[PDB]
């Protein structure tokens, strides 16, 4: 089992799209490295009722799951400068099956 | 508990004389930490502590549970210049 | 000498208890001497440690504690009981989380309550000890057959 | 008397009855219900600790109304007049009078056997209406009056301590949670009623270990009631550790937890403090070593303290709690191995010379696990009700409307979310409780 991440580099203000592959009482998430700083975790869905956000991304980040299609999003809007970090993807079924983690950096234009 | 080391002067130092979380160390004036490592445990399952990187000792802190007060066991001394 | 804690994991009503006052063997639960039994096993003397809690089987939340103090695991099951030959796999889970290891030193264990039929085919059980990669013994209460057998097997495992 | 129409006189012998061996009392091993009986109604003497320990386990050998028919065989005594005149005033006389003693202490503290049973009952009243004789027409007085009062289904004697308040203020139920609730308040009351559990159960749902078997929850519910109460709790502690992803705030609850645990180890509640290590030692709380690595080290001994009492059969844990003094609240797990390993590694009917006797020894085993658990059951606790705190542990559902695997896993897919495997680092996670994390501390006034 692995799981995989899609997404790039875009300026502020911004409509980011980001998603997994997993290729069941389960639990996944984002975290974010932001270089220099400790690793953060910015949102999760426990299936078991909605998701949670980290304070940072309250209004502007959004979690889901296409169950039909294995995949995860996180939807990323506003951006900002400071969101600038590699953005691991992570499923906690029985084991912590984490991602590689794309980059993604935001300039202002 | 016994650690008997070897080589001389890559040093060396398993042990034996049976706990669930255990910290062997290297600690070599006045002696002060120059490495541990953690075998078996949590979250902390191998980290590994370094001070930065002069008669060598080893260490061993054992424990039952985390929340155990340790019993730490010395070595003998492998000082080398 | 080498000591060895063994833990007796198994479903209410299989004979868990049985299986032990069976090892060690009036009996008195309380004194020292019912859970302790000096054996030699191999040629090698040892002494067993065995760990027995039947009838705390409703202190759910309790099971992960008893099982870290062992080993070795005795996971039984009743033969005319087919939910405890089912419930087996979550007892091995359990054990694997605990210790925190894929190769747990366990034996698994189908015991003969003579009272109703057979329900459960030794085809069935060794076929799951296979895929598990651990020993299958059948044992019967009230002849002792085989209870030497189960605890000296699991023994063997854990060297 | 005849040997045939009076069963109890077949006389003593090595097929009918065994002592114990060790200096003037004689103590049954074995023998058959007749012989049994007529030891329970002697008439050189009487023998009140062989009349509490047959009433109490008799079931298992003897079905209540058997035991009723007995009882009246026993009292219909037939005739053989200068030696049959000691045949009256020597033994009819305590015989009878030794029958109704038993009736007296049956439908007195083991009444149940005739809720279950209205027959049971008619034929016992029946019995004592055929009681007549002015030496006994004022047992049989006593006898009726305990059935009527039977069918009728705080006084502190110190002041109590004042009543503990940390953050949430009395009145406020919707702020009651583990870090607000004043730590030493949440001892008490759940000491209280955990020991209010702990005294509800009756010797009718352990003897037997009929807890264990099919019919456990219409013969076992205040004990089952018991051991659900004490593992709801400790999957309320994980759930509140491993559910605070945040690492200070997490090492705060588990802080505020071994603070509780100090006081349970105070109000000698042995059941509240395994509440507590059991929760400290599931596979998601122990796991968490990030966590421990900043518990103040007076709090670590604390906890080792508690740990320490499980560890070797427990051991430390027997010890302790033959020393201190009551109120207590005992650890009942315990007592429920013993009476299971008791009832079956002893034989149930010792033969000899080729016909069974009933082991009244294994019986008269149990009844002693039983009675030291009514030792600890008469002395209550000098504690005052917060009936709003009581409503809050009442209603604990760690659990939701999950199953129990399904929960289990979520609470270790959560340990392994706040700190993870070697590898990977640990992540930080935003806080949740608004409120300051400062323990009030666990001492009075």
Known sequence: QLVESGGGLVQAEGSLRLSCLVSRSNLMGWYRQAPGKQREFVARINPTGSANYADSVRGRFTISKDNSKKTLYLQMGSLQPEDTAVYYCRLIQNRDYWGQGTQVTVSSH | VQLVESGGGRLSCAASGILPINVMGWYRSQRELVATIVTSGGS????????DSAVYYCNLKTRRAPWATPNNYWGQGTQVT | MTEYKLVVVGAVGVGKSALTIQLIQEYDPTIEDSYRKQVVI????????????????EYSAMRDQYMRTGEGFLCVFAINNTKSFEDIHHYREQIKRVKDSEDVPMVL?????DLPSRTVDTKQAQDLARSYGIPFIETSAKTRQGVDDAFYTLVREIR | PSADVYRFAEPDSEENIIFEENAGIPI???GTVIKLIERLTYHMYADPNFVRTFLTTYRSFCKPQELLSLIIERFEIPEPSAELKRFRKEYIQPVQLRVLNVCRHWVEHHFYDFERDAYLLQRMEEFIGTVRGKAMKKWVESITKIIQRKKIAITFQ?????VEWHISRPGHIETFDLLTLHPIEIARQLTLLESDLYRAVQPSELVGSVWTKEDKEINSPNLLKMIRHTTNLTLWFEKCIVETENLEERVAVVSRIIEILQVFQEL????????????????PVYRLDHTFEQIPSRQKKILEEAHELSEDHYKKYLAKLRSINPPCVPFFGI??????????????????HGKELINFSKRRKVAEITGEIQQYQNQPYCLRVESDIKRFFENLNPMGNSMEKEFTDYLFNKSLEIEPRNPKPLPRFPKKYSYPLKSPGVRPS
């Open chain 2, 44 to 51: 902390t399952a191998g980290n590994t502590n370094y001070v």
């Open chain 3, 42 to 57: 191999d040629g090698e003397t040892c002494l067993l440690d065995i760990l027995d809690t039947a009838g705390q089987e």
């Open chain 3, 109 to 113: 264990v189908g015991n003969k309550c």
């Open chain 4, 28 to 30: 049954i091993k074995a």
């Open chain 4, 158 to 162: 110190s002041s109590p301590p004042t």
């Open chain 4, 268 to 283: 000698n509640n042995f059941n509240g403090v395994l509440e507590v290590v059991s929760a400290m030692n599931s596979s």
């Open chain 4, 335 to 352: 007592y429920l191995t013993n009476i299971l390993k008791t009832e079956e590694g002893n034989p149930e009917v010792l033969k000899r």
